[PDB]
Amino acid sequence: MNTVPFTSAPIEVTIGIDQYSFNVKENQPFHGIKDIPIGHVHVIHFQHADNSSMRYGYWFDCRMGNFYIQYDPKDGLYKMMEERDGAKFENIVHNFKERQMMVSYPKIDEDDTWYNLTEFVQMDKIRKIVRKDENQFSYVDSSMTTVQENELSDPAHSLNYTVINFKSREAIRPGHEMEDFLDKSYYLNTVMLQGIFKNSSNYFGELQFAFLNAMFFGNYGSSLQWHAMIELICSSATVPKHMLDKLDEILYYQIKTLPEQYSDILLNERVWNICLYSSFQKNSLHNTEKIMENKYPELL
């Protein structure tokens, strides 16, 4: 198990760590989060009590370095930093653990929710969507725009998701206009899977990362990307059988984890009704269709 210590908590804030969120009071004694499961990426995120504008946070993997949080009173946010002095870090963490100044991430002999939400997400691919090569961790917030969003303004603060556009020359072979528009299989399998992502694991990784940024930060461009990647699969008549089965599991856990009160803004009626009821794969998402119907029968 690993740890993300905090220098302090000078301002009142709601802190998220993966799917858990909790509160710390202004100048309430607090030195961070222990017992973080090794082997997964993680996200630690923040919403200030005094200005709920801007949710922001950091994707990280404790295997890649020793990371801590420190409030910056000039830039007014909690910043992640890497400590290169390994013995200094262990000793700080030991003092905080002895004094019981760190909240415990849940252990639980049963849960797989975080694994299921991050199964294909790797830090290395995150760092290529979020370009800041001097840090081993990646910052995302509510307001960051995507490359495709910018085509339609600061490039260094952008989410470089793979651009998907169904009415584009990349998507449509000359001479196969109707074929390729009505059946996106060549765009999915040749252009995206073989060409760009190389395999379905990397595709699912970006899909999962896009969902998590939409959910945790209310990042609108990430929500667009998540829906586009779902639509591209459901709108293909020819999809490898293992991809369809895995997609059903992925979306099931994403729909299970979504706050019921955020569904109005986080779910696109058109895409979901088309995917569950009209598309080629309308009969291939049994688990997802069942949870959607029992939890959000209104949208449909």
Place this chain on the structure above:
Amino acid sequence: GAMNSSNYAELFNNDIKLFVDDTNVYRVTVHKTFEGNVATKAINGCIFTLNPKTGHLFLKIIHTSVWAGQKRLSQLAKWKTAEEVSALVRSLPKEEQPKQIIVTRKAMLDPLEVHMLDFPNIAIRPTELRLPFSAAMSIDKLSDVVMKATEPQMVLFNIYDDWLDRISSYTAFSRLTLLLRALKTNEESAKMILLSDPTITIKSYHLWPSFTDEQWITIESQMRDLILTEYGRKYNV
């Protein structure tokens, strides 16, 4: 965006534009089979592609052989239309290519947009006008060339005859839309109006009769009365 009554003079400015109507592309007769089921038989159709400023009509005849062995023909027909319009644009010299294409039915937007990806600067627009171009097949010379076709064929017409020698495009388009609306509402009576007087003929190189300015006023008034009449007969007014 969409074309409507508020931006109607835009049709007659100096930016080349074409209307595309796909109504008559896929045409069928529905009949009974020996077993008492219902079947369709296709007949030749046409794409109606019209420059409203000049009157130039690019009538692409759609021969029934296009549909042989194909499924979902009403969907195919939209993509075939878009394929043929794109082929027409590519065949035109650059300075003759349109800057906008206005489709009369919104279901043509995506097929045409996809076929015209190579032309990012040509705007594809819907319209909220209810234009009566489906009645093009009530014009005898257009109907005749479509039905006689034995192969795909493009035939070029000026749908305004020589009217632009005496009237503006705005007025010519209004006359055309009135004639076509009348032919659409009561074809028999409209044709009776147009041919009542045997001393008014259709020139070999024209589509409509050679009416003098005063006879056109008479004709146009008779067409308006017809449309209002049928609107009465229809709604009991």
